[model samples]
Target: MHHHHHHMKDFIKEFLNERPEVVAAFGYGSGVFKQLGYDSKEKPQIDLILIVNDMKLWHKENIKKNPKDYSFIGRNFFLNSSIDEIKGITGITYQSNIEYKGHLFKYGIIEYGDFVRHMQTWDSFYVPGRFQKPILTIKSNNFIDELILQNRRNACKVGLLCLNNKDLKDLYLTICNLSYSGDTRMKVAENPKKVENIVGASYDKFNEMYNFNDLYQKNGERIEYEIDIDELPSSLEKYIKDDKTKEKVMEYLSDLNRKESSLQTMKGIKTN
Candidate 1:
């Protein structure tokens, strides 16, 4: 289901109005979509990602405008230096427990340059991972928007590489699992059905994002398609394309899964 709320729109718009430096923004997580057993009455903390022009100026201005939106640490932390120096997976900074208007909000801030790298390379699976799922566009930029599509399709290509042959729903599930392939949360407190619920709850939306015609053939209930290496995204083009197989693709992604997950976990541990 799409974002149908009018006031939610007001909240995000007003929120953005306060910070025009946000080049692009996205609203995601349970606050935007209903998963299985989702609570309608209980308002979830709104999750957002704001891709700013530059964090240096963005923070300087934002702190002056809405000081309370930031945690004490975030408020004190200097953004004058390149956030990349921290070696965080996505180089995105976060501030949460924000009382914006009436809703509790948690927003991640990343520069446009870093966001582009993550989307294009899938090196920081955290940002690309989140974009792999369906999300609401709170604010949009042409470059970031195009990269979002590129990231999702490349992710779909990677997911399809692992599947020899599968149903349409399974394909959706595989794509959904890419972000969480080696996530530490999966081994900890997160729900066992988390991935399944996400795919099942928003299957149609996933179809619109992925389901490439070059990739699939539809029967009555499920999809049947030839797995072709040439259809892979250019991200994998560096590899020896001729030697590739489903197993080889999995091996590459398995290493990717470990590295990205560990880096992401370390960054998450360093900060929210």
Candidate 2:
């Protein structure tokens, strides 16, 4: 079943009303778009995106604050954002921040309409393997093509860790099938078994690919990973430590691989 946090909605609605400058106010993230319920005990941090007439009120000094605030990850804090700065070059944008009651919150911003449109297209792609926008920012007339590339990259990391040959092979095939600048995917596909010992056999499973409506199931919390990206290099430093930079590179590659695999999974399944 789908989930909704009534407290979060009421809080955000009241907050928006307090600020008349907000022309368009809405919710995003797992809170609204994904139907994820907020855990009061967990001190769920609310995510909101609002469009305002001007960017003046988004400044740090102007942000609202309160003494009584809820905690996130065991600490009580609030966050907020100024939409204009984040959407700087991208026409449609807004600033945002987070707060508990009236306490000061950390703020951030992003392009509003473009984001919603992106989600709509992504959801549509999952439904029929067809979309209005590709997953990557690449120049592609075909929307699903870029998404397919991204998914393959994302799923490959997990596929390897789980040693799920089927998923790994699926990612390999998906990448091989995409339309890209070159044919490197095929080169990598020639020896897929080289990385066969990475998958984790005992792992949890999730629902269907397009099951975006429901956040939590009747059972225990849904499958979610609490991994630390920083610790990965220390674990694999012996392999490619010297070849790559310490400050960055390996972690980016890990994320890239995962994204590549996930994009492939997102738009490859053609149910329609």
Candidate 3:
């Protein structure tokens, strides 16, 4: 079911506004500003987008960590705002300020529209280099979760359209391989070989990942696919409520294909 994050917005706003250095803040993560008007009690954490106008000041004076109240949920509040600084799990910080060709990912979970625009590339698919840190942190986890949700929904629908075992196998492999491409989520958009690796990985290894009955049970959510194959083009349209969301997903898929094509050309040239 679609969920909204009204309470999360308020908490995140308060935290960001705690210091005047935070210019503007927004919520990202699993709740990508979808305003669905429905609430879910399952995942409840305020992932924020905080724009720090004075990053150097915080670093020089050690301002990001509040030692006075240095504890959260029974843990110490010793967070490293800068990327270079690291110690225990309590000191390391999540990726909030990442860059690609001078283009920086804007602070905090700004908006669905902005986040969607940036995450359409291969980078969103790959996991980061610092593998020790969980890819599911409150800050960066939202983007990945959103991608997985969209792909899962679309893949499930595609799988339901399958009639024979061969077709079903192909569909399942495609989803697992391509969806799990790239070393880091941000790097997925830039590296073609990584994407191809996942494609190959899926085709070769996907069937062994799950049982056939469970796969069928999960893919059974596609009402449109179960109803008609001839009318699939029109039938699937009913599943998507937000036109913008659907467009973004398709756009991301298209770009992903282009990267795969580019990789093929590079490989051929290298072999010559």
Candidate 4:
């Protein structure tokens, strides 16, 4: 069940009207997955990333205006800490399981500065890595959109470093694995085929947005390119700490190998 554009517009308006201070907002996760046969009735919690100029002020105003949305700690004392204090303590302030107008929302509140910093620096693969995938932008200024574009390009650069000459599937899979490198859920709770689902669902958008044509050429049914490891974006270089870069790249490639092997095995059984 896909949401009509009109419904999406109204939905975005509802949240923006409630919190006018947000500089940018994006809808992500299963709620934005409008692929065929997807059962929207499963009712995944709506995921949002609300970028604000000042998180402390944003939280303070939000707490006052929407007290019911927060917990006891959030309601009374969340605003006492400075923005730096909150981020230093928790890395980020993600308010999850918020019930609003019968829809559940899980949103992370971050300052615009931090959002851009993470995108450009990858100090933590939190925000930038999320932007590497497709997301529905509800509200954003020109600056924010440009940052998102650059971040996506950086994602391509990082992904290219892990491959010799690969197709879009391999590229997207590599990009998807970057953020999940050390994540525990990737091995269990999250769908094992999460990267495949995301890439398959948004291939056209990914291809267009990243302009794969410029970087790769068609070879029969495969897309190929040659990338220099030295050309990889600086932010991603940190992942090479203690000379583990090759190890990290191979780890992600192994995921691609496993999936390809599984697909081949399934086909073999079907033909037999």
Provide the lDDT at 170 for model 3. Answer: 47
Is candidate 3 or 4 superior in lDDT? 4
Task: Give the alpha carbon lDDT tens digit for every residue of 37-124 in model 1.
Answer: 6656887888888887777777878888877766555555544335564436656766766777677888888888888877786555
- Across 157-239, the per-residue lDDT of candidate 4 in tens digits comes to 66776764566578777877666554433555444367667777877767666675545565644667766455443544655
Global lDDT for candidate 2? 0.31
Q: What's the TM-score of every candidate structure? A: 0.84, 0.29, 0.27, 0.79
| lDDT top scorer | 1
* Better by TM-score, candidate 4 or 2: 4
How do the residues 114-138 of candidate 2 rate in per-residue lDDT, one tens digit apiece? 4333333321112111111111111
Residue 83 local lDDT, model 3: 28
lDDT of each: 0.71, 0.31, 0.34, 0.65
* C-alpha root-mean-square deviation, each candidate: 3.1, 16.8, 16.2, 9.5
TM-score of 2: 0.29
